[PDB]
Ligand binder design. Sequence first.
Ligand code: MN
Ligand code: MN
Ligand code: MN
Ligand code: MN
Ligand code: MN
Ligand code: MN
Lengths: 356, 354, 356
Amino acid sequence: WRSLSNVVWGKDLPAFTYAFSKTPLVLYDGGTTKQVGTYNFPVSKGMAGVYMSLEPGAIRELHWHANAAEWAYVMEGRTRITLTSPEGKVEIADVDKGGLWYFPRGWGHSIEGIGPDTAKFLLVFNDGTFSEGATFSVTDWLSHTPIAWVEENLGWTAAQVAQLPKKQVYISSYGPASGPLASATPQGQTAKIEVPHTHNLLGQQPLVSLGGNELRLASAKEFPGSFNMTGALIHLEPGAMRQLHWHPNADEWQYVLDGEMDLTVFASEGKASVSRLQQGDVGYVPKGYGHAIRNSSQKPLDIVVVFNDGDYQSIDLSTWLASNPSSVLGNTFQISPELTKKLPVQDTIFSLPTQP
Amino acid sequence: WRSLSNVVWGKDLPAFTYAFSKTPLVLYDGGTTKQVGTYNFPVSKGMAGVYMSLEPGAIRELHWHANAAEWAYVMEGRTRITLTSPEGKVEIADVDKGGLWYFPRGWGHSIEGIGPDTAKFLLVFNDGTFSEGATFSVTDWLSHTPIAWVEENLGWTAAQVAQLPKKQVYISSYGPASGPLASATPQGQTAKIEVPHTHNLLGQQPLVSLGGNELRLASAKEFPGSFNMTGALIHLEPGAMRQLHWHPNADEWQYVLDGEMDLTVFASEGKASVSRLQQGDVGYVPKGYGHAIRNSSQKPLDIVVVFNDGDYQSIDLSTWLASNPSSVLGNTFQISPELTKKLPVQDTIFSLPT
Amino acid sequence: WRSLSNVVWGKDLPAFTYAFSKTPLVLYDGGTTKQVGTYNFPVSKGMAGVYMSLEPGAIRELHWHANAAEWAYVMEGRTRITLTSPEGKVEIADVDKGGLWYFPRGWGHSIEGIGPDTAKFLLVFNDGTFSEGATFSVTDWLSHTPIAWVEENLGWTAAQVAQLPKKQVYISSYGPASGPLASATPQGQTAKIEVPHTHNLLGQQPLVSLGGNELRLASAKEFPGSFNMTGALIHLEPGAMRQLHWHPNADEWQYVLDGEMDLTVFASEGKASVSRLQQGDVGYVPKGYGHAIRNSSQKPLDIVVVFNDGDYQSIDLSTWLASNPSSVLGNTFQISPELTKKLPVQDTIFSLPTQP
Ligand SMILES: [Mn+2]
Ligand SMILES: [Mn+2]
Ligand SMILES: [Mn+2]
Ligand SMILES: [Mn+2]
Ligand SMILES: [Mn+2]
Ligand SMILES: [Mn+2]
């Protein structure tokens, strides 16, 4: 990719992409998981991503993590989540392909895979160092508390408490698989969480559509419950791009659902990168960096991106230039008045490859 | 204390308690003081604690600290505070045994012991590195400003300025002791602070109480002036405990008013601790860590705990398990359907001895 | 300057002043510039300052910086700014001598000097590590993106792109200089920013006036656009001082507009400093530190000062001593009742010279 400056792409810059599709899965009993955060992807400071899969009847046990909020995109299949708030309120809900969930910092939750196939989902966390091996597990908790005290807390005999796990369980296919949603009632009288904490992203109408190119956006404006995180789906036709832009107020974490994605990134100071991502690869654009993404393949492209802010903010190059008077633009770009008037006058979000 | 996993208590973790009652006092003319923060209790990042006493007519001098808010519980005796806000408003007030005060970051204040006893109190600060040696003292200030400038600001002669203290006074019993409260009038016309910055804690009705065990809570709901911080009193009968829980949004700092406390802290990744606290000893429980406290002794237990958030938030293991369906629970704990049904169905905050 | 404690001024403290007047200017085509941040003035953590000048028709090119907000005071002459918000809204306005602007983090902007002489202004940033060499330049941007993508984004030929600059332009005088304000119209339909992002500071009625001494203040109350930054103008007569005070909620950055300033700073634990600043020199007071400033010269003094909070808070030694009862003051200062009653009973903010 030639550039007007001949910058050596990548030089003096952290990687902005990670070959996540090549990270080995860690295997569990009815589940798989891998993760990418600052520990292996140094640039990714504000967010970490976790791939996880659950089979039918496999649960990611009751756990919490106060150091991070959990935003989720279900890529395939069907899950059921439970979520319990600091106010004793609960949500028990199904989330399917294209659905989101948001677990506020430190709230207890679980995720179970419901049949017939395997649920596969992404979990993005608003803390770059987050690791699925440093969550707080209830099985770990109760097995690391004096037995007498657990007996007292539960009102149980030693023989009863003795049947609890002896260490963190993490993922379980011990059973039973959960029944129909309507029957999944709390064992004790419990007030329902009323602000929705799941949401349907994929089935939204596009916010923007231009010759096949599509953007669906879920910010606090459409998913108020995810109050400080936003996510979007972009669909890119062959040859098309998301125009050049930057986000004033957020980092952008990316994952390629299918296709091949070219991403370019401008730090300041004459430094910049460009590079390709395969299906299942990950990208990260730090707050304020200029960037753009192009589909250079023969096939369509789908990615999900996530921002660590509930208020989606974008300034496109075109919008920016369009807002300035000729004189300013001509002076900045040092170009003839004839060329000046040919700068962008409106902002179409995507840009098309040239027409037949 | 046996566990299911036979975990070695304390292995791979910092101390969650500090033998404060063994920390020596520093002595002043009319008061005494000691402190615990990250400098001697490394885990205590979110809060630091100071113990202080004031003889009658001794005063903690006018000072300020922009780097920390000051939240207080009066353990014994009676005090009088003054407090001056950025809008030139003042509160002059009494705080007795069981009373709170909150001094917003950088607002000026003073504390005096009124009669007829020794006032003893705890100051808790939302900054673990806070040090009583690092306050901005007005006596220190004027003695460290150029004489000429002090003359000008006060409109005083060299001989008048000459009589000010030569270095930080800190605590003084020079006098006079203070008059009745209705006579403690500002020397100049000064508007009064209207949102209360003191509060009565010990005197509240128990928020929750079961079989003699009681919890008194002062969050921003009951003490809005303390917008930033929350305080609580727990009284625990022999053999009883606060249930297993964690706090999603805050660190917990603890002091033992009287009795003996057993504290357990579980830190994740198979690590956990359990230990005893004598009276006057201090505990700290990092945000989000699971914990519980228990009275394992023949006498009663009384402690004050403080959170660095004004919105008290708790998830009790019981509420949590109660909120979940049979299947999820059974599958998680890998126990039988019959045992599953015997998991908590309600949360009584405390658990009684069986 | 003698003191009651005989403190060795400066000892165990960082410099609270910086000889900015003697920092070499970096020369551009019709513009000059120099800067002070933590890189050369270690104490200045919360705010960095930039001096800049533009000739008629010299523009500081279209750029942005998400890492910091921009508060400006115009010292001499006249400028025009443009500011584009995350919602494709624009303000295009003139800012003349004594006027402010505020550019929110990561909003895109530009500054042109308009006639007739040299525009001279201060830029204060709410990040003490900000450096004018690390902004995001639109020209740098476009010369560091794949050419084919610049083509597609702009709907332009390779021939047309070859005309754009080849590296960061920074300051341009290529022209044309901008025309009358009413003709400075955006090149494409752009809604206007409705909340004013400029403000007349020097033109304000003084907030406080005592025997020639005057403070003019622009917090969020008079300039709500500058939501988290405050600026003030202090005029100080020969012999006069700003009373001893501290700010509970903000650091203070100071620049000497003309005259000769004296700053004392008190830093806790028997440590304090005092020193002189010449015109063009810079002062910094960390939050909470006790301070006062005095004019010890035979002529007048003018400073601008900036705060990294939109809510102005000051507690004066006088307001404070005034609000306590005699017993408290007497006991604290260890002095006779007689003397106690002669402490301040009101607050005039300045103090007139008391030397006979
Ligand atoms: Mn989780
Ligand atoms: Mn983007
Ligand atoms: Mn204090
Ligand atoms: Mn607790
Ligand atoms: Mn700028
Ligand atoms: Mn000041």
